[PDB]
């Protein structure tokens, strides 16, 4: 398996659907290596739950929490962590407003080497229970022989890209992790790192982050050949008064680069209502009425969540994926799993028009490029050399009575799976 792309375990589906899936307990297990230290980058944390996901033998080993919390929320997280002597925290500077530290990554240092995990789940019980989530597992990276001179770099430049990503934080405790990475051989890595980092970027630096990073990687490492772009996510930024402000202009332009139908997959009310969680799935799908009412044009790009291929049509998506299928969806030019939702905050927007890219948040993803495997395209694995696309193709359009799930309005005409209504406030 050259991909090492996985879904999380979903509670309440048949065991056959969890056979190739991983729980956080699986990732942290002694079978994955003899843990010495770990860093956990995320947005939301439940420290008590988190510490229990580590096996008993590893629970006292040092853990770093990399979060973006401020003020009182910062205090609460510190309070939450206080009991656990072995836990430190690193607050990621969020200088631009409406930015979040959204990246989901684990750095796992073991006796036998190093592992990097990039995924889509918050570190809270609910994100790993009945959600469709994604995970990329690096190989076990060996330590570089104390007597030798080598870069430990891959053809995808992953090691140097991860180090730059970590460097942008400008944080003391990450420098230690940067130095651990320096010591290790990451040359077997076959994915490309796509990061977002808060700032305003100019010159050659435009290419470093966000969708421009993607544009660049697709220019240099894909080739040209009516191939649709598919984008799938769980949160929706304010995109502008029409598609030309951002969506089809700079964002789709980046996505269509190589060497055009746009499908966007976002759960409908109906998807959420009849899900395994019911309406409380929508607590993880924060599309507000305020933002939605500003951009009604967007919703005609919207397609339902369907995932019979992976038995997860009723496990609401918290995964975020972007890809470029052929016209019949039998193959793809590339695949991206990432923390980046459909927002300017996450992907970046052009300022002082043309000259500046403005990114608000920290985001991280891995891009699977056929060229990194020596191929021209991947075949889509129909039932979750052939990439495991975790939802159904082609994506199905919203029916005329469907609406996008919007989290802050009531749904009281029909009960959900659990016979409840949804009344926010």
């Amino acid at each position: 398996n050259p991909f090492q792309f996985y879904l999380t375990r979903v509670s309440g589906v048949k065991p056959k659907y969890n056979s190739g899936a991983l729980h956080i307990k699986d990732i942290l297990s002694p079978l994955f290596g003899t843990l010495v230290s770990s860093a956990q980058f995320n947005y939301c944390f439940d420290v008590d739950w988190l510490v229990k996901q580590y096996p008993p033998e590893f629970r006292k080993k040092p853990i770093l929490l990399v979060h973006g919390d401020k003020r009182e929320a910062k205090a609460h997280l510190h309070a939450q962590a206080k009991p656990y002597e072995n836990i430190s925290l690193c607050q990621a500077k969020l200088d631009i407003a409406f930015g979040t530290h959204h990246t989901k990554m684990m750095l796992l240092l073991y006796e036998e080497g190093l592992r990097v995990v990039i995924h889509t789940s918050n570190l809270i019980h609910a994100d790993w229970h009945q959600k469709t989530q994604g995970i990329w597992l690096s190989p076990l990276y060996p330590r570089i022989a104390d007597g030798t001179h080598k870069s430990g770099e891959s053809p995808t430049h992953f090691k140097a890209n991860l180090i730059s990503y970590l460097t942008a934080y400008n944080a003391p405790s990450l420098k230690e992790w940067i130095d651990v990475i320096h010591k290790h051989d990451l040359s077997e890595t076959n994915v490309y790192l796509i990061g977002s980092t808060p700032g305003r970027f100019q010159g050659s630096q435009k290419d470093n982050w966000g969708h421009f990073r993607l544009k660049k990687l697709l220019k240099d490492h894909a080739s040209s050949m009516s191939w649709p772009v598919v984008g799938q996510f769980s949160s929706v930024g304010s995109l502008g008064a029409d598609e030309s402000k951002w969506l089809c202009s700079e964002f789709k332009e980046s996505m269509l680069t190589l060497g055009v139908p746009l499908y966007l997959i976002y759960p409908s009310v109906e998807n959420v209502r009849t899900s395994l969680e019911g309406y409380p799935a929508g607590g993880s799908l924060p599309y507000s009425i305020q933002t939605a009412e500003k951009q009604n044009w967007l919703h005609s790009y919207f397609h339902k969540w369907s995932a019979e291929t992976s038995g997860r049509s009723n496990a609401m998506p918290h995964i975020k994926t972007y890809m470029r299928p052929s016209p019949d969806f039998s193959k793809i030019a590339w695949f991206l799993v990432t923390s980046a939702n459909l927002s300017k905050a996450a992907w970046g927007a052009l300022e002082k028009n043309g000259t500046q890219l403005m990114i608000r948040s920290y985001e991280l993803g891995v891009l699977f490029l056929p060229s990194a495997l020596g191929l021209d395209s991947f075949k889509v694995k129909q039932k979750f050399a052939t990439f495991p696309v975790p939802y159904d193709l082609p994506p199905e359009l919203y029916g005329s009575k469907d609406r996008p799930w919007i989290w802050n309005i009531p749904y009281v005409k029909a009960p959900d799976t659990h016979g409840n209504m949804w009344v926010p406030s």
């Binding site: 947005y43 939301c44 944390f45 439940d46 979060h67 919390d69 929320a73 997280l77 918050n122 809270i124 609910a126 607590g283 993880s284 924060p286």
Partner: peptide, 5 residues
Amino acid sequence: KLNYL
């Protein structure tokens, strides 16, 4: 932050 809410 313990969740989005």
